Amino acid sequence: SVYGLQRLYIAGAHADATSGKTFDTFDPATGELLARVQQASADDVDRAVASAREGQREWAAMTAMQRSRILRRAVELLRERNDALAELEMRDTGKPIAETRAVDIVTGADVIEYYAGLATAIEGLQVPLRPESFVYTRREPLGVCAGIGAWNYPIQIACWKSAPALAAGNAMIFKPSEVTPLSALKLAEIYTEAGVPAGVFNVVQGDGSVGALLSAHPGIAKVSFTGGVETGKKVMSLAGASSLKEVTMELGGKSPLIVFDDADLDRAADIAVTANFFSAGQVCTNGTRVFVQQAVKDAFVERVLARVARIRVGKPSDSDTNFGPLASAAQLDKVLGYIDSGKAEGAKLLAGGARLVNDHFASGQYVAPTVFGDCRDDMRIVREEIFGPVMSILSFETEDEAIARANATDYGLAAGVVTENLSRAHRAIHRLEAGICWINTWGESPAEMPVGGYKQSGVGRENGITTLEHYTRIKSVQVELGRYQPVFG
Amino acid sequence: SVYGLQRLYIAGAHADATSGKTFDTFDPATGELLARVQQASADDVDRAVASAREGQREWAAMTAMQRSRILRRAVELLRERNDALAELEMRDTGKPIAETRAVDIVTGADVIEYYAGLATAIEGLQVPLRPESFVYTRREPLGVCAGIGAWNYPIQIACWKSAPALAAGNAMIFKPSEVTPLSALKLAEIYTEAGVPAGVFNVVQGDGSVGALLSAHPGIAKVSFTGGVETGKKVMSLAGASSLKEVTMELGGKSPLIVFDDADLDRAADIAVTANFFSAGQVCTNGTRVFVQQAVKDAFVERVLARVARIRVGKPSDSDTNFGPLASAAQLDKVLGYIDSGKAEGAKLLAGGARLVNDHFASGQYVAPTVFGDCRDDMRIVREEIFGPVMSILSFETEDEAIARANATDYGLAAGVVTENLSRAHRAIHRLEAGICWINTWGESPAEMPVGGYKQSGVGRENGITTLEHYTRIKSVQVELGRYQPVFG
Amino acid sequence: SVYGLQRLYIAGAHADATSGKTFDTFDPATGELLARVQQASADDVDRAVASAREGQREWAAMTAMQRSRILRRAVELLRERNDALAELEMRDTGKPIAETRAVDIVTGADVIEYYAGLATAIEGLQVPLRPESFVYTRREPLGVCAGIGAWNYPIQIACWKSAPALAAGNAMIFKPSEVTPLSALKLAEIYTEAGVPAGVFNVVQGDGSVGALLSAHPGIAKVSFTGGVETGKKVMSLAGASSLKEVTMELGGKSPLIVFDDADLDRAADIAVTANFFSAGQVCTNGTRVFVQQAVKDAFVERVLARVARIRVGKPSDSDTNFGPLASAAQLDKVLGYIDSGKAEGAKLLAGGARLVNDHFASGQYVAPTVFGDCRDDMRIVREEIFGPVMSILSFETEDEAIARANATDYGLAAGVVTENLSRAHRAIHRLEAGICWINTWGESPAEMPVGGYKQSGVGRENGITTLEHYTRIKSVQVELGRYQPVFG
Amino acid sequence: SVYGLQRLYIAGAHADATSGKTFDTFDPATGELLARVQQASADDVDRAVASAREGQREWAAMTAMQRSRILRRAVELLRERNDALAELEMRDTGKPIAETRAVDIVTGADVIEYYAGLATAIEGLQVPLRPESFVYTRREPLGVCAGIGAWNYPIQIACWKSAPALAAGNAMIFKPSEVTPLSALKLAEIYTEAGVPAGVFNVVQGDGSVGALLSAHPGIAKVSFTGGVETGKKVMSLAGASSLKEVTMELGGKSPLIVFDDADLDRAADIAVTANFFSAGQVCTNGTRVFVQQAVKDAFVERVLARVARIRVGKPSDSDTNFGPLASAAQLDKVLGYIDSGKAEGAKLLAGGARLVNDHFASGQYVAPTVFGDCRDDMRIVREEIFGPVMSILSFETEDEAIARANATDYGLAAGVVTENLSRAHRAIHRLEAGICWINTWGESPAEMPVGGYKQSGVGRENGITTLEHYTRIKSVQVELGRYQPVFG
Ligand SMILES: NC(=O)c1ccc[n+]([C@@H]2O[C@H](COP(=O)([O-])OP(=O)(O)OC[C@H]3O[C@@H](n4cnc5c(N)ncnc54)[C@H](O)[C@@H]3O)[C@@H](O)[C@H]2O)c1
Ligand SMILES: NC(=O)c1ccc[n+]([C@@H]2O[C@H](COP(=O)([O-])OP(=O)(O)OC[C@H]3O[C@@H](n4cnc5c(N)ncnc54)[C@H](O)[C@@H]3O)[C@@H](O)[C@H]2O)c1
Questions:
Q1: Are residues B72 and B172 in the same domain?
Q2: CA distance readout (Å), A205 to A53, A151, A189
Q3: Looking at beta carbons, which residues of chain C come within 8 Å of A440?
Q4: How far is C-alpha A250 from the geometric centre of its chain's CA atoms?
Q5: Same domain flag for D72 and D221
């Protein structure tokens, strides 16, 4: 194996698990074994909670500025090690090195940096009731938080969950996806090197059974989960049933991109291609239902296909590549099944549609960038999240029609519109039932911008000032300065 | 029956249920039948959701000030009808008319009044990213919210759940406790009279199975529940597993009141009595573990018992009464079982301890105000919420000991201290793991003050500005004003 | 006279001044004497301050909700008396009854209503420093505030200054313009009837020398002034030099309206006419420099002139009138001098340009709606605020040129653009140096929206949540719970 | 001279003035000439404004995080150079090296660090008006700001004024006191080294005439001033009269320290000594009216005198010194004049009272730590700020008396109480008319805590989130998405 045996990270050090079990992580471009990874046992999760409880006490007793400085040092280390971490993330995920060098660590560190600076701005309120009595609130740490990661943006997710948790004075136990377990360990080392106390960021490893141990643990105050809707429902159920934990969930989507007849069509085609094929289509917010107004449909499709034909499919370790394999064979099987469904249900295959098996591609999990035209709302590929590089193009006649069809889903993660018109841009966005909305762009997720789902695409939010506040619990304190008037007299 | 046949309230009118089933509500002071009440079916809940969806559209399309004015009119009607509603609430709950006339409707209307004024102050954010792009957020209504009530403060709970929901532009379907189904229908009539559109406040009736219909319904965006911890775990589980609803939960407690050696002991005894015997002990925030420092224990207990002996136990319809029956026979059986447990495990009975069965008391559910001394942390009466008039007095030696023992519970609703010392008052409160904290007072819950539980006593909060914010969902809108730089070039 | 002798309003009643001096107010449509008005002396201002100090104590001692309810009662009275107050305001100002019935009292009451609801939401902060110490802030009333009014919106200005001051717990002494002294006394009667304590809203009367008495008085904590830039500089100077008062200033402008080549030209012409001729041109925020892109200049001008020709100039007491006289002979002389200047410097007269003196118009102060074309940036009519019905139309070629020329002024009150393009609308507004910015509309000033000037057009803001915050002063309280470590040991 | 010829700092470099004039700065411990400093001319101030305008454009066009990183680098440099800057500040001010090494740069950098992290959290609002229209606000930089410093905390004041100004995207032109001109130049170098663009922090030098050039300059948007009340009144007057600048002022005080009969008397004596003799008494917030309740007066005075006798008066360059000379001969003359007044008016001299003239002290400006007892409210030393090491002790009988006498002043900067009682601590502080209030401590000014004066002790605030917001101006933007309804039709 490339990276050897990897283990748990508890109490400021790498540590042997006590399960007697390991799992494998692979390079999905080559099938090379990257590491054997020890799986945490229930005892290990218990120990990680005890460790986090102890570290949280020391961390929360520091001043807000002491925490700020330590997180700022972690940011420095992430910037310094960006390229090395990007190489590891590329190996583990299959995403192109051109992506992991520019996006994954950059934006992960961006959010740690943002919350490092805001760690001093967490304030309660004060309000008088009368001259003799007033109320103040404290925003106290929750305690020990759990984060459960997905495999498409492993280190970015670890950063985005741990940053507001740590900035607010919590500890976090993080479990990466078993598909991509490696970079979370590097973040744990960096937090320790930056000065984070032992236990404040612990990493446990394993499959969903280890995630369930975290969701059920009575010593954990909050769970933050990124993954599929079916798993999210199990997590929220168990986290609530076990000990009434606070919950945040980010759960995938079938987000609509609406290209109006007064769109800039070059802009629209660029957006649609980014919104469907970045990270080989494995992005929760991807704009996978592309609604295009009839009058510009043919011109728009011509532009999309010309851009899709120029995608540089290749080895993700090659800097010239901008589209690589999917992250697993299970991914490839599911995506190819959806492509079969689209063909069977009468969608028109306009580009791609098959696994690449020539030369080195045969050793990886490569599916061509795929575009279906003449799609209908009742098709499986239109109704269900594919989580791969499959664009569905749907025509519409009127603005009201596009909005109604865009909203006719139980998903609600993202939405976007392309139009040059001032009124249409805002009025359409205001009617779309999604938490993350883009006008004349797609995909950017600034640290300042709260992101999360409507409907079954999630609960709660990440990023922005509001998310830092949601990693605290409110204590209201009423001070009575006057005589307590007896109620029983 | 006193009040006749009572039904559902859907789409601005009373309406027949379709379950084929009814349940009875009684006067717990006399056993008189107050009403036969129709139970909602699954199809009735569906109809209530469709009605709420329609009303929510009209309500949200109004301006914030239009909603504010209508809620202010509802406040006027609640003030005008205070005494008539207080009589109804006294009949249904058994709480003294002296309480329901001064507290239940007054404070329910107080919170509607507060949120009416704040309905115009729900604001998103704006933040620039660069000259070419900026973000704004919208705080949009969730849609249809569900509220599930408890029987100890029926109309107050209905007011506190519906006020922020309606002010933020939502509709609410409310289910009162089957023990106290009557006053919620009066609130629904009042909202309609005040100008609330049909469907914006609907009432369904029934036992826990009807509450579960609401928690599972895919058309409901949020559930707010008041009740016991074990029911709350079931609700949060089903609400999350069904459709990833947002959840607020207020779940009872075993709140500590710490009387220090430098407390004003008259103040402390007054607080302890209020904190244990108001509403015949049926208050979630009651200070039912009374910790008293050894040096003042005997003097404190003497003062407590002198006040307990002056409690005016009697018919709740008599204005001179300040302590009446419990709300049901099941409540009485549970409370009497706890008294049996306390005696068996060795707690010293200092006052009360038995059912009152002389003269008219035999026809009601009356338990004497009960005080146990020499309690231990391991006793069932100290570990478990009794939800009746049973005070447990525990001695301690040191401040560190009192704080450790106060925190050694999975509950976390309220806490309080009595001390004349500036440093001790705040330093102790800051270390107590509870959401609702009182210094030299107990029990007041101003509209401005967020209230809710730590640990297993709750999720989320009620009241205060922050609670209005959590009856909206955040939509982030990024506006790109410049060229979209192609990612696939 | 129509309304008789009018006096001061101090300590909850009308009261004789002690200056020995009076001044007259006239109806600018007819020259009829409306009232003889007593002028306040320095000793009267002292008495008003002592009265305000006493009333402020009672008012601030009330709860926030008590103040909220009283302000809401004042709103009810203003709505009930809207038409009678509108008639008075039309007589005193000369503005059409169609305006005063729909705008002046409606929007004055709108802002009192908004702040009434927010009076309960004034909150300080709390922030911990370390376990042993924390800070909270109080937002305390300033004390006695002064408001100085202008004659174009007399009762609206009185409402907008007094509403945040009173909601925050202050008293206010208000001096209306000597041109329009009457409606402020009616507002003072209404506040008293609504339950405002004696002294909380006092009215003094007189010219600028009485305004200076308020600005200099050592017992006044803050001055809010509406008026011309040159008077404002005198007020802010004296307010600061006398006792370091806080200051809010709203000072008029020369606001640009930019009509782009992709504007809806019917929309643009409607906006331009409203933005220049409402209230006979006597609006501080009027868009009196109308920049029009060359390609649409002729078509835009044709539409403007067609609308100007349909303005209904007439008696302001007739409901069919939508354009009446100016508020005084001094105003007319100034406006006519500007028209003379524009003609001399070469501006092309397109409409209007002279006093109306036929039939009844001869008895009033009427100037025709006037439009100049082919204007230059160096013209006096383009550089200087006219405060009358005189539109200056300026052609431009490029967007960069329009923005540069729009910004090339020491004014900075308002600005606006007309364009159908999403990018242009926001990018242009973000570059315009004005506090009040409109896209595809003009003139609306919602209670939620902070309004005020950049550069020499003002200091501070009115309306919105932030303005309520600036009618309080911050007290920071640090609580030390631990040992004070000696600095001199 | 020790440091040679020092000059202006404009456009990223040291620069020759064009006045032909210099002034001298001295070491007040020895009379050694530290530097000749060039005085800025009017042309130099004009050039500094043009430079600041250009640098502000580049600085504001950066992202908030780019500004944050550059300010964070400035903090690193200040930490690295703390001891060297502390030595310079000790030479220029006369304050003990034990103070300048621990306080002046530490807390100056603390505030830059705080605002560096908050530079990303400056947000406007968004609020809907109706489906067809919404408002958003921008918080835009003011532009070029001016800061005018005092000599008691030269580099700390430069940091505290420049930090929120720069974090919010402004440039600042700073003029240090001519008594202490040196360390502001070092801060300017550090900002440049950290990456601040040329012109964003410029330093001009000279006496009050140069300060007046800044206050009058039409290109400056805001003035922030620290100094005496008489000068503050001139600054606010001229800043308002010239161009309606925004103004912040911090202006000295006569702050009361109230020692109650239930104070910890050792704590109280420690506080009183710190609050009167730190920085040789040259602190604006010093607690120079020490009110002591009669029952503890003698015990309190005995403790104060014992601590005063242990003050280590000596050379400020000696690390063992904790009390050095005053900053100038003019200071010494004024302080000795006040001491003469106290003696003449009958105050009892309890400690100190004279200049130290033995050995090396004769070459410095040394006044002994001085305590007066049996003071009265009508004494000059009690009514007027001395700005030197002169404590006035006043006895009182009742709590109401102490509060009334504490408030009977036109000052209102700080106040504090010493008491062990919870109720008394808060109820007294809530009644004291001062912006900066301390319970059982004195003098700490955390970055999170807004600080400034009531009454004639100031306008506006420094520090806290609120001050960052006051270095922006609000632009409200109304977007109309629907049809503009013609007003003239
Ligand atoms: N503020 C609070 O935290 C608060 C106040 C009042 C009561 N309580 C708690 O309520 C308890 C009362 O117990 P109880 O057995 O009479 O009532 P409960 O807790 O079982 O029921 C409360 C409400 O939930 C409904 N319900 C019951 N089972 C449900 C289910 N599975 N799904 C959905 N809704 C369901 C009930 O019909 C009722 O409306 C007290 O012991 C106390 O702990 C809490
Ligand atoms: N919102 C605004 O910015 C706004 C709205 C209305 C009017 N204005 C301005 O008001 C101007 C009207 O000019 P005007 O000469 O008739 O009135 P003005 O500006 O001189 O006076 C306005 C008010 O200030 C008082 N006043 C006058 N001199 C004073 C002094 N030295 N100290 C204190 N108060 C003093 C007046 O009595 C009156 O109440 C218009 O040209 C326009 O620029 C501004």
A1: yes
A2: 19, 13, 15
A3: 422-423
A4: 7
A5: yes
Resolution of the coordinates, Å: 1.5
A chain contacts of residue D131, beta-carbon cutoff 8 Å: 427, 430
CATH number at C384 reads 3.40.309.10
Is any ligand 2 atom within 6 A of the Cβ of residue C370? Answer: no
Based on the fold, state whether residues C257 and C245 are members of the same structural domain.
Answer: no
Of A72, A117, A131, the CB nearest to D118: A117
Annotated catalytic residue C284: yes
CATH number at residue B90: 3.40.605.10
Q: What is the 3-state secondary structure (H, E, C) of chain A?
A: CCCCEECEEECCEEECCCCCCEEEEECCCCCCEEEEEECCCHHHHHHHHHHHHHHHHHHHHCCHHHHHHHHHHHHHHHHHCHHHHHHHHHHHHCCCHHHHHHHHHHHHHHHHHHHHHHCCCCCEEEEEEECCEEEEEEEEECCEEEEECCCCCHHHHHHHHHHHHHHCCCEEEEECCCCCCCHHHHHHHHHHHHCCCCCCEEECCCCHHHHHHHHHCCCCCEEEEECCHHHHHHHHHHHHHHHCCEEEEECCCCCEEEECCCCCHHHHHHHHHHHHHHHHHCCCCCCCEEEEEHHHHHHHHHHHHHHHCCCCECCCCCCCCCECCCCCHHHHHHHHHHHHHHHHCCCEEEECCCECCCHHHHHCCCECCEEEECCCCCCHHHHCCCCCCEEEEEEECCHHHHHHHHHCCCCCCEEEEECCEHHHHHHHHHHCCCCEEEECCCCCCCCCCCECCCHHHEECCECHHHHHHCCEEEEEEEEECCCCCCCCC
**A473 in a structural domain:** no
Count of structural domains, chain A: 2
Residue C318 lies in a domain: yes
Same domain, D274 and D217: no
Detail the residues of B annotated as belonging to a binding site for K(+).
25, 92, 179, 244, 455, 458
Residues D246, D123: one domain?
yes
Q: Which of A237, A286, A426, A474 is most worth mutating to test chain B (most B CB atoms within 10 A of its CB)?
A: A474
Residue C435 and residue D311: Cβ atoms within 8 Å?
Answer: no
Q: Which residues of D touch B136 (CB under 8 A)?
A: 126, 136
The answer, yes or no, to whether any atom of ligand 2 lies below 6 A from the CB of C162, is: no
Q: Among A181, A142, A183, which residue's Cα sits nearest to residue A164?
A: A142
Q: Which domain holds residue C202?
A: 1-252
Options B284, B297, B315, B399, the catalytic residue:
B284
- As a whole number of angstroms, the distance between CA D442 and CA D103 comes to 15
* Chain C interface with A: residues with Cβ < 8 Å: 61, 63, 122-131, 136-138, 419-423, 425, 439-440
Active-site positions of D read 161, 250, 284, 462
- Closest residue in chain A to residue B415, using alpha carbons only: A477
Is any atom of ligand 1 closer than 6 Å to the C-beta of B250? yes
Same domain, B56 and B121: yes
Structural method: X-ray
C435: nearest CA partner in chain D = D475
Q: Which of C89, C250, C297, C315 is catalytic?
A: C250
CA–CA distances in Å: residue D282 to residues D28, D30, D208, D211:
14, 19, 20, 21
Q: What are phi and psi of B257, to 5 degrees?
A: -115, 120
**Are C246 and C259 in a shared domain?**
no
Indicate if C188 and C312 belong to the same structural domain.
Answer: no
Q: Could you say which of B217, B252, B287 is where a domain stops?
A: B252
Question: Which ligand 2 atom minimizes the distance to the CA of C176?
Answer: 39
Residue C193 designated active-site: no
Ramachandran angles phi, psi of A449, nearest 5°: -105, 110
d(CA D113, CA A48): 34
Backbone angles phi, psi at D476, to 5 degrees: -95, 135
